[PDB]
Amino acid sequence: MFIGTIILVLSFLGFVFNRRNIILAFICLETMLLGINLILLRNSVLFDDISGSLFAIVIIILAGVESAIGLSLLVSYYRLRGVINSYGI
Amino acid sequence: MIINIVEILIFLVCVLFSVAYLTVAERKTLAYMQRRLGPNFVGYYGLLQAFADAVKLLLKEIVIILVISPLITLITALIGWVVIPLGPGITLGELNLGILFSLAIGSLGVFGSLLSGWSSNSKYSLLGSIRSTAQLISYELILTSIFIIIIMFVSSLNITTIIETQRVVWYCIPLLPLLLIFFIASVAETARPPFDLTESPFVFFFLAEYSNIILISAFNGYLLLGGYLSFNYSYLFNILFNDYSYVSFLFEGLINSSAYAIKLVFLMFSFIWVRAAFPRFTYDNLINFCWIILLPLLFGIFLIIPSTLYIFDSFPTL
Amino acid sequence: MLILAIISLITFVSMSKLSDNRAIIRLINIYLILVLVLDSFLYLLFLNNQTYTVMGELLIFNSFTFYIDMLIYFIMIVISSLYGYNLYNNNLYKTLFEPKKELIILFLINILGALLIVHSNDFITLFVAIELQSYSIYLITAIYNSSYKASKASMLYFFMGGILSILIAYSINTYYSVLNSYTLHSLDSLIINTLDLNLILIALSLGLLFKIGIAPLHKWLISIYENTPILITIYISLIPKISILSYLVLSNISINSLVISILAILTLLVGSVGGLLQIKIKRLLAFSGLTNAGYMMLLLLLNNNEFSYLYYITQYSISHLAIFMIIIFSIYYINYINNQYNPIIYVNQLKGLIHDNAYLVLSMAIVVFSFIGIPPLLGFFGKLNILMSILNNGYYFISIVLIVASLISALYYLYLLNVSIQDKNNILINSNETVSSVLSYILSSLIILITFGFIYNSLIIDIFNVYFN
Amino acid sequence: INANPGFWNGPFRYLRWSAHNRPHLFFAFAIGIAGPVAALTLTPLRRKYLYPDHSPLPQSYPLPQRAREGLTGFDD
Amino acid sequence: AIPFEALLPYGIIFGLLTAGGGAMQVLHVYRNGGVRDRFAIDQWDSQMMERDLRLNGGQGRKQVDQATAPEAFKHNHVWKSERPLI
Amino acid sequence: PREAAAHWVPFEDKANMPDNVPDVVEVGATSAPLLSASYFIGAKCKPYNDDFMLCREESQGSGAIDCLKEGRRVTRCAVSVIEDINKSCLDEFRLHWQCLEQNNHQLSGCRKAEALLNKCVFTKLNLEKKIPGLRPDEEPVFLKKDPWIKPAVDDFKSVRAYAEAKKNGTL
Amino acid sequence: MYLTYYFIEITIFLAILCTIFIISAKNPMVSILYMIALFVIAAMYLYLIGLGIFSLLYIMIYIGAIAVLFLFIITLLDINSTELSVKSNIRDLPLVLISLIVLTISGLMIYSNDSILINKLLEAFGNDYNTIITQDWFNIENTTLLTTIGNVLLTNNAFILLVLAIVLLLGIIGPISITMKHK
Amino acid sequence: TAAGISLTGGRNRCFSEWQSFMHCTAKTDAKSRAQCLPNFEDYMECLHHTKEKARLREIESVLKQKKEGLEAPPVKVIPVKAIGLV
Amino acid sequence: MNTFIIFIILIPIVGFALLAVNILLAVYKRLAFNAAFILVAILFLPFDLEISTLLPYVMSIYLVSNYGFTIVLLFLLILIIGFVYEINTNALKINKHNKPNTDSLIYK
Numbered sequence A: 001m002f003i004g005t006i007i008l009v010l011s012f013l014g015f016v017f018n019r020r021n022i023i024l025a026f027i028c029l030e031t032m033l034l035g036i037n038l039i040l041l042r043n044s045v046l047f048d049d050i051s052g053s054l055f056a057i058v059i060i061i062l063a064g065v066e067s068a069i070g071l072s073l074l075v076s077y078y079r080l081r082g083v084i085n086s087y088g089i
Numbered sequence B: 001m002i003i004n005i006v007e008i009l010i011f012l013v014c015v016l017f018s019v020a021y022l023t024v025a026e027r028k029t030l031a032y033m034q035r036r037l038g039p040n041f042v043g044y045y046g047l048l049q050a051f052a053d054a055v056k057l058l059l060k061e062i063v064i065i066l067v068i069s070p071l072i073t074l075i076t077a078l079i080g081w082v083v084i085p086l087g088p089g090i091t092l093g094e095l096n097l098g099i100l101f102s103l104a105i106g107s108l109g110v111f112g113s114l115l116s117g118w119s120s121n122s123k124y125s126l127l128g129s130i131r132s133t134a135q136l137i138s139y140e141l142i143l144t145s146i147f148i149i150i151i152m153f154v155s156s157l158n159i160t161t162i163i164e165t166q167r168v169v170w171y172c173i174p175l176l177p178l179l180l181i182f183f184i185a186s187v188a189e190t191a192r193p194p195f196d197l198t199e200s201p202f203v204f205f206f207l208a209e210y211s212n213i214i215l216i217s218a219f220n221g222y223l224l225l226g227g228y229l230s231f232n233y234s235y236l237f238n239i240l241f242n243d244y245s246y247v248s249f250l251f252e253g254l255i256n257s258s259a260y261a262i263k264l265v266f267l268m269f270s271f272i273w274v275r276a277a278f279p280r281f282t283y284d285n286l287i288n289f290c291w292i293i294l295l296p297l298l299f300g301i302f303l304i305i306p307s308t309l310y311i312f313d314s315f316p317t318l
Numbered sequence C: 001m002l003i004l005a006i007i008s009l010i011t012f013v014s015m016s017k018l019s020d021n022r023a024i025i026r027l028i029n030i031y032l033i034l035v036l037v038l039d040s041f042l043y044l045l046f047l048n049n050q051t052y053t054v055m056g057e058l059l060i061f062n063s064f065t066f067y068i069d070m071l072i073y074f075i076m077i078v079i080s081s082l083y084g085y086n087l088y089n090n091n092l093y094k095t096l097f098e099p100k101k102e103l104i105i106l107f108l109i110n111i112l113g114a115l116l117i118v119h120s121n122d123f124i125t126l127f128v129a130i131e132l133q134s135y136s137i138y139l140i141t142a143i144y145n146s147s148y149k150a151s152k153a154s155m156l157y158f159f160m161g162g163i164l165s166i167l168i169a170y171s172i173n174t175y176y177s178v179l180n181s182y183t184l185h186s187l188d189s190l191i192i193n194t195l196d197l198n199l200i201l202i203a204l205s206l207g208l209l210f211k212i213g214i215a216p217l218h219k220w221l222i223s224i225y226e227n228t229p230i231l232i233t234i235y236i237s238l239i240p241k242i243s244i245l246s247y248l249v250l251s252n253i254s255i256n257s258l259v260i261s262i263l264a265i266l267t268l269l270v271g272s273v274g275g276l277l278q279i280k281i282k283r284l285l286a287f288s289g290l291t292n293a294g295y296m297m298l299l300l301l302l303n304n305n306e307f308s309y310l311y312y313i314t315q316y317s318i319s320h321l322a323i324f325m326i327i328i329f330s331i332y333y334i335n336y337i338n339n340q341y342n343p344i345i346y347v348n349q350l351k352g353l354i355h356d357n358a359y360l361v362l363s364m365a366i367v368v369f370s371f372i373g374i375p376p377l378l379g380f381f382g383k384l385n386i387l388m389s390i391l392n393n394g395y396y397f398i399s400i401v402l403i404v405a406s407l408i409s410a411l412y413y414l415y416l417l418n419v420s421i422q423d424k425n426n427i428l429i430n431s432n433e434t435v436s437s438v439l440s441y442i443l444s445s446l447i448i449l450i451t452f453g454f455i456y457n458s459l460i461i462d463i464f465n466v467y468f469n
Numbered sequence D: 001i002n003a004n005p006g007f008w009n010g011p012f013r014y015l016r017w018s019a020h021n022r023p024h025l026f027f028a029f030a031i032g033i034a035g036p037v038a039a040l041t042l043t044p045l046r047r048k049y050l051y052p053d054h055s056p057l058p059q060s061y062p063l064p065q066r067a068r069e070g071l072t073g074f075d076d
Numbered sequence E: 001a002i003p004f005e006a007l008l009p010y011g012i013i014f015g016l017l018t019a020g021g022g023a024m025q026v027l028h029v030y031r032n033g034g035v036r037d038r039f040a041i042d043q044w045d046s047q048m049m050e051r052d053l054r055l056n057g058g059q060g061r062k063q064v065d066q067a068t069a070p071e072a073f074k075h076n077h078v079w080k081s082e083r084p085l086i
Numbered sequence F: 001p002r003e004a005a006a007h008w009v010p011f012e013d014k015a016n017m018p019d020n021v022p023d024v025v026e027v028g029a030t031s032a033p034l035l036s037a038s039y040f041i042g043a044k045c046k047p048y049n050d051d052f053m054l055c056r057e058e059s060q061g062s063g064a065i066d067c068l069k070e071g072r073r074v075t076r077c078a079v080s081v082i083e084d085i086n087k088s089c090l091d092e093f094r095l096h097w098q099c100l101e102q103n104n105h106q107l108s109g110c111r112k113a114e115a116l117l118n119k120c121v122f123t124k125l126n127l128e129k130k131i132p133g134l135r136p137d138e139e140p141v142f143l144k145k146d147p148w149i150k151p152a153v154d155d156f157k158s159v160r161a162y163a164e165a166k167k168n169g170t171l
Numbered sequence G: 001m002y003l004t005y006y007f008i009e010i011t012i013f014l015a016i017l018c019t020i021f022i023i024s025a026k027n028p029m030v031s032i033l034y035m036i037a038l039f040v041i042a043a044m045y046l047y048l049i050g051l052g053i054f055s056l057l058y059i060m061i062y063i064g065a066i067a068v069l070f071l072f073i074i075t076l077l078d079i080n081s082t083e084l085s086v087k088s089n090i091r092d093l094p095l096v097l098i099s100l101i102v103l104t105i106s107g108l109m110i111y112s113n114d115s116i117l118i119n120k121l122l123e124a125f126g127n128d129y130n131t132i133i134t135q136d137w138f139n140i141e142n143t144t145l146l147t148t149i150g151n152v153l154l155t156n157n158a159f160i161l162l163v164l165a166i167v168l169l170l171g172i173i174g175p176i177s178i179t180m181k182h183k
Numbered sequence H: 001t002a003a004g005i006s007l008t009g010g011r012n013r014c015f016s017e018w019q020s021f022m023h024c025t026a027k028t029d030a031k032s033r034a035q036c037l038p039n040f041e042d043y044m045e046c047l048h049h050t051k052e053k054a055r056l057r058e059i060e061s062v063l064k065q066k067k068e069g070l071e072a073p074p075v076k077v078i079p080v081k082a083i084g085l086v
Numbered sequence I: 001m002n003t004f005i006i007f008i009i010l011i012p013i014v015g016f017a018l019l020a021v022n023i024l025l026a027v028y029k030r031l032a033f034n035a036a037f038i039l040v041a042i043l044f045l046p047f048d049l050e051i052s053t054l055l056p057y058v059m060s061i062y063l064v065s066n067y068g069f070t071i072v073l074l075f076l077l078i079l080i081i082g083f084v085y086e087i088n089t090n091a092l093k094i095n096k097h098n099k100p101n102t103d104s105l106i107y108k
């Protein structure tokens, strides 16, 4: 549970403490979902069931469609502006 | 220990040779397509072409990332060689999820196209690298979807299980349109010129290109056509051999690898043969061909297969 | 019969042109009306609070959920009857309030996402349905792409909803780690004694609650509500609130919760004193959303909150809906129009509205007195029935701070009237064109519910008694 | 030029139109509709006329529902 | 007619893969002691191959056959320990 | 019921069966012989195997400690069948599992020594292969002629033995 | 042979290191390159625990699609970015040194069921005990993991796959809802 | 749902204690669940092995201090290529 | 030590060697885009990702007989209407201004 908690906490503080660009926010958000998976899949193994793996194979998909949606949101934000700012939106 | 290091030695050395003799085979056959001699020869001295220009290619100029993308492109092109079997149960590593691996490495192969456009950047060159990337992923879709509709008849992710299932009839002869569209999706993964707007450290892209050529030839050969299968050959052996011996296992492994290599060699010749005859695509035509016309047919073939397995009993058991 | 609509209309909208969008929305409106009329006999299924678990311990169908399930279609008819229908037939009113091509698709995808939470039993239906509705708010926000504020608002809402979605998924995963099951009834009142669950069940609550505007994290939602256009925001202020609040109220996972009681008090404080010095109307209106969504963590602390909740939710939805429709009427009479997406921005702008017409200010007066709990109105008995449950179950300081919050809030509700009944100097003598008939009949009906719902109060209590007990 | 007649201005003429001018959407939608429509019409004809369905495979060890009559034999 | 210089590369490629696969089958048969490989291995089959290694003594898939077990077969049974998986 | 680890460490225990469980005559047959003799130890020891799995069912959780008596008796009668098939048809049994040690132990590849073994055991040891759960008007698969799935190489000794059994007329 | 023992704690240390190289990088592409490094360290851990199937699904979709997606976005877009300077980011240090301690310890609290608040934490680390693996011969066909996911998504949880269809539907409609500008 | 389905489709490693507890709650009137508690305590210890961990800590605590170490039939570790060597 | 793992250890060594011989032997020393280019990759993901939702069915196709069939058919038939959304809306097609709009010449 160490590797999942560490990816979650450190990815979270990498989300919170940026002021430099917009993409570090996206990729820290994506590694938080990885960090939740790393805890869930080991609880599937140690309890001997698939149902944590059921929630895993569902949240893979929701992380995917999340990225598709949110990067179309960014292209909306970029079309009207000229250049995505350093400080943020 | 010694038992397996000699084994991976023989396989690595054979595949490393065969990818280098393809660079000679393409020059020769395109020479005789256009009535030229082309390269002087092809023998044991014949590697000294591909050796000599592979040496001289390392003498030009280039103008940390630039180090990494040729490297990961070549190692992605080289790790996929374990999972092909060359005979029954002969793999360099045996794994029950070989198609999942093969599929994940067709997914890993796209990154060098991204990271090659960053080096020596311009605005227009960066846009061109974007176009090569997007056609690469666009045909990777239909690649993966037909892998599914092949393993619908197998219902197993093991590869020797596919070919032993294939023993009764090859999958190419019921699903012949699938062979046609895979051959074009196979010259689509690679940049073969019906499909090559976006072309028209370099030694790694050069090697990994032909390695992907012959490796997607392998991926055709085991799942669509017979992998190592030619015929039954039960009757010829009962006349030749008297009992199992190392000569007998040699002769059968020999004929199995011959039946695999003839598939791979005819398909490999057909890549160079479809190179010469046709001009190249507009990129709009490329994306339009991938999505609007071919992929609705792909959904249709995908719906018509389980319904055909449904009409009869005919669900495959793991 | 949502998906029977969605699958059909998505093919129908794919082929229709940009001019056809109004009449598409008119079709979907009438469809939802007849789904409410011809299919509302399913109340008979329950008669003694009978609950069904459908699709195999996955959805949960009871009568609380049937009422929310009916409420959402009703308010969607009122919302879709706005985009279908012209306000006036002028050049301005065509270039204002234009519905996009994919908007009517995203509404019904959001209603699918909102209904699959109130009906939800499993955690995986919870997670998939909060994701479906969170995407739909990401895209209902951003569909007016050629607006600077709307694009900035959608990009903010994205990352904040993303953090709270991973916090919910962490809580779900953690409850799975301490107990093998996902369903909430694996609790069944013997776990909670012998098991430290308080931290998990609050973090599951606080994950949804912070998505709605629980007040340490209230600053981002007010910014999104002020930045979207004035018609996206009536929908995206109503829907996620009522959908997850009826989730968290149906499944009482945080009783006696001290964190919930603190944040309830902090909500009632900072909402009622945040709306005090504010000059923008959607702001004032969104903090009125905040205090009223903070008479909600209160009932969430309770046990057996299904008279107080349901009565107050349909109170609040009618009152909410009516006052947004009042300022959508008020934009014709104002002298200055900025910002095509968001035409009235300041509450200074609707001055002297009684000299323009008097009956729109009569309507505005009954809704603003219904927010502050004036006794012959329907909004009064909502606070009365919250207080008959707060005091019933021991929350006495909560009751005093509830009262003080209501009094501080009325100070900025009445600013709308203080502005709207004053001398203007430029009165209207004759309007050539008149407002659309059905779209003012809807507001007249929503008034007469507010002013005459105490008539049927007693019938509702008897009906309620039969059908939830 | 060949323009759209409409599905509603004559169905069969429209299908004849779409077979010529858009065969990448006719013979793609007509090969995928011939699956779930043939699964509702060609399966009872087979179960009556060609051969009935197969016996199901076992999945675990098949326990009977008896009450252990006492066996005799293989004592020591 | 047919060009021989065009067909000698593909002849070399064909012969390389041929000799490779023949060598591979002989190496696998030499490791297993004269029997072909198991290509698809169940969990059941993996437990069974471990039991065969335990039974025959040391060698891989010797496939011995006996009316009973030896007395050492009762005692050589192993359990697998496994780290905490933190 | 679980697949092994990152780093699993094997161990054994030099110990003894303590006091009250008597000594037993355990099956010392490898995968090929007991896969070959599976239908025959399933045909003779049906009620003992049934009785053991029933006793394991009825003592829920007691389980392992409860029916030591009775997994003693399935081993004895399975050992009895395989001693009888040794002394009965060691040559043709051996032919069948020397076949079945190639071909991944696929049963598909060895029809030819199989039918010979089935004649031998049905004659001397009078046990018969049945696939139960098979309703009538469904042919059992090891009886059909010209199957679709044929092996790669028919092994040599069973070709010879099957041809000589044709010539003798015992088949 | 006990070189082959610490393999899990190794990858834990590598994940710590790899996120330190996520949030401290010059280019915006260097961060996603260490991110695909993080996905493959994760997939090594997932193979290591006993899940060979997932690791390759993580390679297929996480250094598969969404990688290529992010690399693609960072190519064809300009994004200003500053460096991790001390004059703009040392002010965050005394909050980080509190939140590290509190969030890690509290994230290791809820795996326990006592009510002492020090015996809760000390059950997270007090686990050096080797689980014993027995062989049960009850399973007859190789229903591996992916078969059981395909049995549970399709029978027991068919509605989650069928709502999932609507989510992927929305992931197709949304970018066409935005990025088209019809007429 | 997927209540007690295992990795291989069977039952969990703690399905029996859970099914015992659900027998307990099926026959028990609400607010009479205090008699139902020991089945629950058995189930939570099946999941997390807490009491077993504390007991093995106390056994190892008495074991690790002594200079004699071990006077018992010992547990012999082997390398993986030597399961059935002897 | 099996024969699978020397290969995927030994290949990065082969790449490092072919790279170090290159470092030994060599010589050294924003524009606006179209919406179709961004949309191909953004929209590629929900079509790559239904494929992996389709991957658990294809392994377990025998067990879910007659019932998981219809669930997969309905799943695909819900996906085809979003596909026909994007092909009705001409989403991937990129357009240009080469037409003179073909307006007839009007006089006086």
Ligand SMILES: CCCCC/C=C\C/C=C\CCCCCCCC(=O)O[C@H](COC(=O)CCCCCCCCCCCCCCC)COP(=O)([O-])OCC[N+](C)(C)C
Binding pocket: C036, C037, C040, C041, C043, C067, C074, C306, C307, C310, C311, C314, C315, C378, C449, C452, C453, C454, C456, C457, C460, C463, C464, C467
């Ligand atoms: C001919 C139609 C023409 C087109 C009209 C379209 C839409 C009309 C929509 C709404 C009109 C108001 C109907 C209210 C029904 C409440 C049912 C109910 O009190 O719910 C109770 C429980 O409520 C509660 O807990 C508390 C809710 C508190 C409501 C607070 C505001 C009420 C004051 C005004 C509302 C009554 C005004 C009557 C006007 C004549 C459950 O009982 P139930 O679920 O079996 O009732 C539905 C049976 N049904 C479907 C056949 C009608």
Ligand SMILES: CCCCCCCCCCCCCCCCCC(=O)OC[C@H](COP(=O)(O)OCCN)OC(=O)CCCCCCCCCCCCCCCCC
Binding pocket: B177, B178, B180, B181, B183, B184, B194, B270, B274, B285, B289, B293, B294, B297, D024, D027, D031
């Ligand atoms: C059974 C019922 C149904 C009956 C119908 C049968 C359906 C099953 C068959 C499915 C197989 C489909 C094969 C792929 C379809 C190709 C589509 C096509 O060729 O035309 C469409 C496309 C242009 O689109 P469009 O705008 O409509 O152009 C009109 C010009 N006529 O054209 C293009 O853009 C490009 C055209 C060339 C494509 C690339 C060529 C690759 C060259 C490889 C050729 C094969 C080489 C074989 C080598 C070995 C031969 C021994």
